[PDB]
């Protein structure tokens, strides 16, 4: 159990991550090295080059034929218990919305396992425990972050039709979107247009301007078009596509990647862990305050993450049948701080961009004294 | 609802240098705001807009080539506007159809605009 | 000798470096990912954080009590034969200047050994040959790049006094420079002022404005002040100070650096090799042409480096007494392309900023078919 | 060269509300361009400039507080300028000394500017 020898292995893994962040926060706030237009070029390098190449490195060295299917089915059961109690609020009550059910699912069930999670668990329980964290990253990239593009695109395509077709929208038979438009929130004018056919059935065409509900076979084609257009423009979907594809070929016929290719990838992916933390300290220096939303809600964004998160996974991991040390890994990976990728979605689409801003930043600062309190209490 | 309908009339083959009278009889709507338009369509691309009988008749944005020569009426109780052309030039064989706004632009297709 | 097995070890070390550069050149020139104000924030991160931490990693793991003193005295003899023939031109002829003797010493004798030199030689001759290249980096950082600050500061402090005191400068007894001014080239107004004492001896004071030669005991205090002020504002002098200081303590009493400190440094220095090459491709996309100075001089900047460089070290390394394989290492480290640090000095002080621009960029592209031609001919 | 020299004269303790006559007799120079100045120096910091007898007398930049009250002469053959004060205010106990420009500003120190 907890000797003082383990407390030094945990600090060797985590103190390097805060040193990279406070030199970035110091650089803009205290010593003014970077202009705010120069910070925008460092965040754009990390988001497009360093982090997509870091997750290719982890996914392509995973063995998909030896995954731990009992550990990995207790994490899929967490996000069904959560997402099914948010369906029973939106339907029995009158004050439930759809903006709040996207926020309360991402503040409960989506932690930061790629950057903080793999170094932390591997220093606490060994090298098997940092291989279980790669298998969770495979499921977040390929399943759970694609159900949250379906929810943001359905939320945007309903604020357009119900706003411009308030008394007529039951007769729309086809919706066509022009290829110049990617996202149909309010950024462009979005001149929509209807063609009345011979029966009285409308034929909607969304154009970009210059200077009841529709049937469920019509809304389901509008969304699949627009989910597709934002999924090929995303760097983190090629990192997941080619990572799983190489991993199925390598571990069946025992093919190693050659040394020209494995060093061409590793020259930029070694820059990935250190500048993912450097870029997160440039974010907290460009916000006006750290607690950005107010004290009433910052105490609510940190109680969904560190209390409701690891309590709905104690129920899910005991029903499947995990015991011993795998139960202790699974309750400590749920108390990690808030991930970064849900913070990118809430900034683009403006759905609480401040509650998800003070959960990434203020969650990193208080996450260690809270993941160390579970580890001294589980191994009691 | 009663199957919201647009009907258009006034097409024909005439001689260059005359006058035509188009119509756009809207029916079966909610509260209709006046932004009613007309525009041309050749078989080629890059179409352009013609007239406007917008909110209260304060400004009617005409095209640059037909400035001060097209009479556009309004009758809010009858809910039908007229596009009166004068001194028909031969380059008027496009497709003219109205674009009434009830928040989203509705239109039809049915005209026979041509001239010799 | 040269089997096809060695040709694959050389390509495994160098093809990763060009992949990181052509994705940066492609990003601004072909696909427009980075604004020119966003490229300025990536070059400033590499110049202040990544590259000073990369050379601390190499210098602090050097053993200063087991240096190869015969190899390291044949490199100090190269830069005496070169620098003494540039003294006999400046003095016998009338067309020799001091602007040309700073350019012709840095285009002959200062290659790029930190970024390209240590991976290349270590893939060609083994692990001892990449340890000899660290000992040369120690001498460049601590000796030869400090004699070239003395020459730029003497060149600037002579274009001020001879220009404003053309008929009187023999009577100056003291020169004082105000602490607001760092470099006395033309950037600020530089109001100079003289105090006539009781004998007729002037007492010069350089102030910053709003809205014959002096004796050699006076010019030698003006320069040492101003060499000092640009040496404490430089990140690459703390990398060399603390690197050599730890290295003398570690290798005498056998003290290893602890694991908290060695991982706090290594989190940003792993980003150093890959983004030193990414930042050099952003430079070649912001210049208008690659061959920036014209074809008459670009053929002269590439003949001083790849011909006169390795021919004045064949003479220096044969007189000291190197033979065998150390003679082959020492003629292949002199044909490396132009270093980056002399390109920073020529841009600040404007002394041929284009001949040293088309030797860093165009030298990287043609340096492999030229260091591979020496290796197939030396091991013949 | 002959040991280039500046001499200054005209200092004294006088009564407030009079007139004084300073001088700046330059000697032993190359070709002297006229940018000759005068400025004040209290024992405190943040000094300010007073007069100018610059290139050809087209514009003489005076201070904001002594506009149109100080007479400044010029004699290029004699190479000596005069600063004539009028209606001496009591806040004139600073140090006045000239700043002739031959490319680099030369100056001396020797005055006794004070007033009651």
Numbering used by the authors:
A (entry chain B), C (entry chain A): 1 to 211, 454 to 622
B (entry chain D), D (entry chain C): 3 to 118
From the publication, what sentences describe this entry?
Here, we report three inward-facing conformation structures of Arabidopsis thaliana PIN1: the apo state, bound to the natural auxin indole-3-acetic acid (IAA), and in complex with the polar auxin transport inhibitor N-1-naphthylphthalamic acid (NPA). The transmembrane domain of PIN1 shares a conserved NhaA fold.
In PIN1, no densities are observed in Na1 or Na2 positions, and the surrounding residue compositions are different. A neutrally charged residue in the Na2 position, Q580, interacts with the backbones of S106 and L110. A short segment after TM5 (residues 165–211) forms a cytosolic domain comprising three β-strands.
